[PDB]
Amino acid sequence: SPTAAVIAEVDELREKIKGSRNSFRDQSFLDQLAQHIADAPHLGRQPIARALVEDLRGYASEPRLAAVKAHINEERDQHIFSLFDASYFPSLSLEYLTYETLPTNPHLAARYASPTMPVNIIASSKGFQSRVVVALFPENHIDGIQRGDDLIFAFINKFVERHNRITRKMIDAVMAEGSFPLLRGADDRTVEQASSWWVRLHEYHHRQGDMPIPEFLRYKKLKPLAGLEELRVDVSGMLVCLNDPELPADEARLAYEYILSERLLRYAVEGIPRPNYDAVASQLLFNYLSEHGGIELHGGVIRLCPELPAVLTEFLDRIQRIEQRIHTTSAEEVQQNLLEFTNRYTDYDPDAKDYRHIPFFAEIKERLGV
């Protein structure tokens, strides 16, 4: 494979520059990196690689990767290649991948438009092979810039893999039989479709509401708040799938099943020893739905109530009433009221100032090794 020989060159340069992360913005390093890229027999020929060489050589006066991102954002081809510095994707340094796009419902694409690119990774350098790396954001490039129209990638194949390895097992063990009938025995192409719908709705709704991100990003980074924000947009996504009549009914219900099953199960068990931000918000959802009649527990198995759509609407309405007070109070006051809401429905240790997995999911973690 030619792409395979390109990636081998990237992987080899990546190996040499590991341990040089502190000089990734030093111009002496960058000139040598650029020269090594340009002199690479297969990689140096690539248009995206010429864009990076030009960007890197100019960095001392323009610390931006403008040529690379122009190439990527215009989809001049299906290759991504750059120098990355993402604190939460530590595996990424000099990296290369090729992707394939997914079929898109046209109403979805127009009414809920965002710069989202749900894609499958076809081939990639080693950093992109880490299971941690599920997406790629514009500020992950060394320049750290994000503009509102930069493309954001989500790697759907990694979400299909997680759903196969964790969510299916959890559906069988934790849900009442018949709970997610469209997802039962679905093939990868079908989960791929739902997951792509999920990410499209997800990104769109992050930018909606009274405290959208990135505008209010620095108020939504505390663990319970970062998770609550993910949950806000995913419940918004569930409700769109339930209520927007211009979406094909069978595809919309499948996407609904996917978002609900991921949030009620896979995300609810993330993090060892303590829940991560997603798990805290999923356990908030779990306890809120149990207490307000959206789900029932019968012998430790979850029943989805017929009334669940109304209880989801009530839950999103409640988040929105808290966020709406941004117009009459401070962001810091809204934060405390989001924390108070969260802590009513989660296992918050006030001395540690952190969270424990609620007993229902602690036992599932023990029983299934998730």
Which residue in 17, 66, 173, 222 binds its own copies (CB under 8 A)?
A: 222
Neighbours of 112 (CB within 10 A): 21
Q: Between 77 and 116, how does the x/- string for binding to its own copies read (CB under 8 A)?
A: ----------xx-xx-------------------------
Q: Which is nearer to Fe ion, 141 or 205 (CB)?
A: 205
Contact 121, 99 (CB under 8 A): yes
The per-residue DSSP string of 91-105 comes to T-SEEEEEEEE----
| 3-state SS assignment for residue 224 | helix
Assigned token pair, 181: 């009938």
Phi-psi region of 102 (alpha: psi -120 to 50; beta: other; left: phi over 0): beta
**Considering only 173-181, 230-238, 312-320, 356-364, which stretch makes contact with Fe ion by CB under 5 A?**
230-238
CB of 166 to Fe ion, least distance (A): 19
Does the footprint of ligand ILE cover residue 206 (CB under 6 A)?
yes
Distance of alpha carbon 309 from its chain centroid, rounded?
A: 24
- Does position 199 interact with ligand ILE (CB under 6 A)? The reply is yes
| Beta carbon of residue 9, minimum distance to Fe ion (angstroms, whole number) | 33
Q: Which is nearer to ligand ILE, 163 or 292 (CB)?
A: 163
Signed CA dihedral, 323, 327, 328, 330: sign only: positive
Q: How many residues bind its own copies (CB under 8 A)?
A: 34
Residue closer to ligand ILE (CB basis): 151 or 186: 151
Q: Does 259 bind ligand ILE (CB under 6 A)?
A: no
Give Cβ neighbours of residue 189 (< 8 Å, ≥ 6 apart).
none
Phi-psi domain of 79 (left: phi exceeds 0; alpha: psi -120 through 50; beta: other):
beta
How many Å apart are CA 145 and CA 142, to the nearest integer? Answer: 8
Instruction: Give the chain's end-to-end CA distance (angstroms, integer).
Output: 37
CA nearest to 285, candidates 258, 262, 255: 262
CB of 200 within 8 A of CB of 108? yes
Q: Which stretch binds its own copies (CB under 8 A): 49-57, 66-74, 234-242, 270-278?
A: 270-278
Q: How far is the CB of 158 from its own copies (least distance, A)?
A: 15
Q: Does 203 bind ligand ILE (CB under 6 A)?
A: yes
Q: Per rule CB under 6 A, is residue 220 in the interface with ligand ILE?
A: no
The interface region with Fe ion, picked from 81-89, 213-221, 226-234, 242-250 by CB under 5 A, is 226-234
* Tokens found for residue 160: 């299909």
Q: How far apart are CB 153 and its own copies at their closest, in Å?
A: 20
> What is the number of the residue whose Cβ is closest to Fe ion?
230
* 131-150 binders of its own copies (CB under 8 A): 132
> Which window, 82-90, 196-204, 237-245, 265-273, contacts ligand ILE (CB under 6 A)?
196-204
List residues bridging with 124 in a β-sheet. 97
What residue 199 binds from Fe ion, its own copies, ligand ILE, none (CB within 5 to 8 A, per partner kind)? ligand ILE
Dump the DSSP string for 7-61. HHHHHHHHHHHTT-GGGTT-HHHHHHHHHHHHT-TTGGGSHHHHHHHHHHHTTTT
Site string for ligand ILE, 154-193 (x = CB under 6 A): x---------------------------------------
Write out the two tokens for 175.
């849900």
| Strand boundaries in 89-243, DSSP class E | 94-101, 116-124, 135-136, 152-155
Binding part of the chain for its own copies, among 18-26, 138-146, 190-198, 330-338 by CB under 8 A, reads 18-26
Positions touching its own copies (CB under 8 A) are 18-19, 21, 87-88, 90-91, 130, 132, 218, 221-223, 226, 270-274, 276, 299-300, 347, 349, 351-354, 356-357, 359, 362-363, 366
Residues engaged in binding Fe ion (CB under 5 A):
230
Residues in contact with ligand ILE by the rule CB under 6 A? 134-135, 152, 154, 199, 202-203, 206, 230
